[PDB]
Chain length 317, copies 2
């Protein structure tokens, strides 16, 4: 009766407005006095590095986040966030989860550690936005960029310096100067949250077509929920995912074409091919670490092979 | 329950299981004794020819359908269903509606005739599935196929003969030869509903990347709803749309590569480019017909032009 939840999202305040608040506001309107979810933004109740354990322990009831930034202690953590070159398209994320087995794997992994994986979804592609233009691979060398831990470990091979700072602190460090840029998002977020005002260039070669994140709930709180509220929560979370699917699909194209705050640059395809090749090596290193990681890597490899065989509009030649 | 709705969908029973039933079942579980929606499938309560009017006058409370097969008395009827070459990608539909102004046009057009447009969504691409192989444009000539009214008028220019029959009758009509084929769906539906069992070939060149359909409600029933149920319905409808986004994204690729009931054929691009060029002339014929059709055609043109400008993963050279 009149359940009180607190949810903390990975998103900063200006971003939470678009990626979590609408669905939480809708849930609250529908649920009324039965249940209310208070939404907190990046690092607000607890820092990122404490977020997973805060939810596990029950201090925070729910989380919207990728696995990677919060360093969940699971075998699938390295696949959340921006797994290099994993998904070309945002719709690949719900398909992988619902049709190629990733939902059952995430559920088992998180249940082991006292957490309910409610649902996964796609967000945006991962692009470099920077103060200085990137026109070759060597231009990546030395760059301090805000990114995710696993994508950052991959990017380090090209001389990139992956920096993690709290999200709310980024804008200024771009304006100057502990950061040279960002590899945390695509162009829709860049314009929306103000990062485009303090960077100058946008590299069109992404290192992922779609971020993977999720809604999680403390398992005890999850099993306490009445059926009707559990279903309501699940449906509002899917609505949140659906909204992001079209928000990003529309935003990336429109802002690339009509945005005047970032100048587009590109690295030639022949040159960028080295990055893609390196990512396959990186996948193999991950697969070697455990049987679960090997299983997931094989699913990504198989899926991408099947896209090539399916052809248009999944893949073109 | 206190509020009782009947919804009729365009989809036959075996199709409704996938494109409407899940979300309506969820709605009913969450709403309980407050409101229930009974879902009826193709032509059950009234024939397709009477569907719009039955909703307008309140015989039926709600409809899931495209504009075109229903022949709604609006200026946007010809854009529903399969508007030839309008949308390369399913996510183009919610983007056009939420970000390029189609939602407001549809709301207005339908309000004039006493119907609430709740939400638009994408379904599947439009492909030929036939008893005999199509490997050239000439192979289309004289083919009697089940399609949508507007797409059929377009295809008529290539000698296709559009035939209209009730959905539940299509399977037997294919078995007996009353139909040479279908151009009503993609491969996911073909396999799911049994049509693949009574046809032999699937043509890879589509004439639309995404069917446009909607949920509609009789305006009086809509205004009678308490706000919380209005919201619950809208959210469950968006969940229905989300489900279709990933159901078709996954199904089209998987069945093309792994299905065994239909043999793939292709028309060479140079040949098929004739069909794409013809479609642009078709759009111009539609624009000639009213100010609102001209407005909508221009939106489709601008959207597709900006897709080309944006580049990957929207368009590939
Ligand atoms: Cl949201
Ligand atoms: Cl999921
Ligand atoms: Cl559904
Ligand atoms: Cl809409």
């Amino acid at each position: 009766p009149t359940i009180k939840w607190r949810m903390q999202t990975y998103a900063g305040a200006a971003l939470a407005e678009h990626v979590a608040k609408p669905a939480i506001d809708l849930f609250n309107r529908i649920a009324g006095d039965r249940m209310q979810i208070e939404l907190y933004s990046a690092d607000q109740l607890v820092p990122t590095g404490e977020l997973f354990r805060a939810m596990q322990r029950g201090t925070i009831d729910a989380v919207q986040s990728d696995d990677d930034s919060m360093a969940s202690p699971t075998e699938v953590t390295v696949f959340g966030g921006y797994f290099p070159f994993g998904c070309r398209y945002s719709l690949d994320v719900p398909v992988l989860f619902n049709q190629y087995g990733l939902k059952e794997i995430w559920e088992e992994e998180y249940a082991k550690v006292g957490v309910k994986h409610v649902s996964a979804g796609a967000w945006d592609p991962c692009h470099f936005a920077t103060k200085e233009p990137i026109r070759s691979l060597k231009d990546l060398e030395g760059k301090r960029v805000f990114t995710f831990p696993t994508a950052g470990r991959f990017l380090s091979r090209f001389g990139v310096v992956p920096v993690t700072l709290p999200w709310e602190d980024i804008e200024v460090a771009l304006q100057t100067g502990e950061l040279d840029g960002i590899a945390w998002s695509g162009i829709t977020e860049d314009y929306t949250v103000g990062w485009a005002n303090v960077t100058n260039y946008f590299l069109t070669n992404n290192i992922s077509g779609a971020w993977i994140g999720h809604f999680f709930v403390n398992m005890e709180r999850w099993e306490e929920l009445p059926e009707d509220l559990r279903l309501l929560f699940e449906v509002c979370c899917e609505q949140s995912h659906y909204h992001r699917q079209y928000w990003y699909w529309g935003g990336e194209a429109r802002l690339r074409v009509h945005g005047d705050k970032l100048e587009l640059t590109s690295i030639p395809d022949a040159e960028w091919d080295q990055v893609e090749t390196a990512a396959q090596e990186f996948w193999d290193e991950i697969a070697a670490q455990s049987e679960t990681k090997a299983k997931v890597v094989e699913i990504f490899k198989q899926y991408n092979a099947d896209m090539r065989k399916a052809g248009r509009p999944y893949r073109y030649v």
